[PDB]
C-alpha cells in the first residue's frame, strides 16, 4: 500500500505538469478514456478526453500571458482494481502585475490500472471552498 | 523506512481531513490517549483526547461560516516503537470575504504504533514562524 | 521505485531545513562537491560547495529578522546511477510586518548515490514564475 502511495503521487505530478505547461491533450491521456472530470462546482462535468480536452480550451481562452500552479498535498487513498484518492489542491496563478493565492479545493480522484499496468484516472471530482463557503 | 515514510503522510493526511471539517473527537481519537498537543507558543499543551476536544472547541467558538485547511509538506523522519516527524504547515482559511495565508508553521510530531498496529499520535509540537519572528 | 520517490522526498526535506535555519554549510554538504546550483534564472550558477555557501551568503547578506520556508511539492522522477526530480516549489516569507507568498518556481534536480548509499544532488535548476511570464 506504501507503493501506491507514491505511484499516485508521481502520477498527479505528471499529470497537473502537462496540465499547467497547457498540454491539456496529454492531461487527457492521463485519464482513462470515459473518464470524468467535474473541475467547477455548479457546471456539468466533461466526460470522455475530447470533452475533457474541450472544456480546459473554453476555460484557459476565457481568461488569457499567466502561468498557473496546481499544489496537491494531505493526500488519503483507500481501497478490487480501482483506488479512492482525497488529496487538498491549492491553486496559484502568476500574472506580469503579481500571484495570486487561491483557491483551496479539497479534490476526489479515482484511480484504476490500465492494460498496461499504468495507472490511469476514472474520476476527478473538485470543490472549491470559496464557494461551498457562500452556501 | 520508505513504507513508514508514505504511513506516515496518510495518517496526517487522515487526522487533517478529521480536524478542517470539524470533526474534533475523530481527530483526537487519532493522538495516543497521553497524546500531547502543544497547538500554539505560549499556551500550554492540552493532553489526553478529552483536553484535546475541548481546546479545538475552545478555538473555534472563540472565531466562529470559515473553511480552514492545513498543507502539510517538507517532510522529514527519524527513529525503538517511536517515530519522530518534522515537517511545515501552511494554513489557509476561506471566508465569504476571501483567502487568507498562513502562518507558516515548522512542527515536530512523535508517532508511536498502537496494539492493532495502526499509527497514532503521541505528540504534535507547534511554532509559529510569526511569532517566532517577533521574538 | 516507489521507495526511492520517498528518499528523495526525505532527502528534499533534509536539505530544506537546514537551508530555511541558514545552516548554509550543512545545506551545501547534501550537493555532490562538484554540485550544480542555478537559484535564479539569468544568474551563473554556484558551482561546488564554496560556491554555494558564499552564494547564500551574499542573497541573505543582501536583505538581513526573517524567516523563509520552501514548501515542495508535485515530484515526478525519471531515470544509470542517477535520478531526475521535477517538481514545484512555493517560497514562503514571514517578517514582523506579515507573510509574502511567492515566488511560484518550477525546478529540476538530479540526484547520484554516494559511496556510503545516501543520495545527493549533482544539480538544481531553479526556474521563477515570474521571471517566466515577463518574457
Ligand atoms: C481548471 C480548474 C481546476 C483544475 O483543473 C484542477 C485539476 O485539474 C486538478 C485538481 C484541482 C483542480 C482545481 C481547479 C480549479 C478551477 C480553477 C479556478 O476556479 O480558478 O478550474
Ligand atoms: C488550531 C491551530 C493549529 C493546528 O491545529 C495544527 C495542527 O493540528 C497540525 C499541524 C499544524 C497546526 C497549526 C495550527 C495553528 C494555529 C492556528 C492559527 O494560529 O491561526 O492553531
Ligand atoms: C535562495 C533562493 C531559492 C532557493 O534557494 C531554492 C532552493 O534552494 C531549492 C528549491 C527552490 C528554490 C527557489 C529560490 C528562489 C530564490 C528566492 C527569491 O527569489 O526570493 O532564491
Chains 1, 2, 3 share one sequence.
Not at 475533457?52 to 481562452?61: C, D, P, S, W
Not at 484518492?85 to 490500472?113: H, I, K, N, Q
Amino acid at each position: 500500500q506504501a507503493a501506491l502511495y507514491a505511484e499516485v503521487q508521481q502520477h498527479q505530478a505528471r499529470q497537473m505538469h502537462a496540465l499547467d505547461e497547457g498540454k491539456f491533450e496529454e492531461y487527457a491521456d492521463t485519464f482513462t478514456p470515459d473518464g470524468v472530470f467535474r473541475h467547477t462546482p455548479g457546471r456539468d462535468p466533461a466526460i470522455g478526453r475530447e470533452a475533457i480536452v474541450r472544456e480546459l480550451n473554453e476555460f484557459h481562452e476565457r481568461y488569457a500571458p499567466v502561468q498557473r500552479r496546481h499544489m496537491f498535498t494531505m493526500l488519503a487513498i483507500d481501497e478490487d482494481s480501482a483506488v479512492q484518492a482525497d488529496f487538498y489542491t491549492l491553486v496559484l496563478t502568476t500574472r506580469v502585475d503579481g500571484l495570486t493565492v487561491g483557491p483551496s479545493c479539497p479534490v476526489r480522484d479515482v484511480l484504476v490500472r490500465g492494460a498496461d499496468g499504468r495507472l490511469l484516472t476514472a474520476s476527478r471530482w473538485v470543490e472549491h471552498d470559496n464557494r461551498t463557503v457562500a452556501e
